[PDB]
Amino acid sequence: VGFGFIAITLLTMFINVGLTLKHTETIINKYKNYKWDSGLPTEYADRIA
Amino acid sequence: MKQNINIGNVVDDGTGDYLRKGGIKINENFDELYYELGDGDVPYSAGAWKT
């Protein structure tokens, strides 16, 4: 008693961004690069258009 | 400007150009060597000039 007081109000917000973020899945690939600079020799043929 | 097409060194080695870049390094090569002398599809033994 005997005192007033003055009141300012505030607010905060608590939010998860990251839980949604993840890495889904990772994949890779196997390739045969045609550079020239080769002989055939092993095997033959095989895949034929 | 001849658009010379490399392959690396010895056969079977890692280094070489490409099959893919084989083309258009080779094809544009045709054109230019052609295009001055040829003008179009066909070469001119008599030569070709450009207006």
The CA dihedral of A34, A38, A42, A43, to the nearest 10 degrees, is 50
- The shortest C-alpha distance from B43 to chain A (Å) reads 29
Q: Do B11 and A34 touch (CB under 8 A)?
A: no
8 Å CB contact between B37 and B47:
yes
Structure method = cryo-EM
- All residues of chain A having their beta carbon less than 8 Å from the beta carbon of residue B14 are 35, 37
A39 touches chain B (CB under 8 A): yes
Asked if B31 and B40 touch (Cβ cutoff 8 Å), the reply is no
Å resolution of this model?
6.8
Distance from C-alpha of B40 to C-alpha of A41, rounded to nearest angstrom: 40
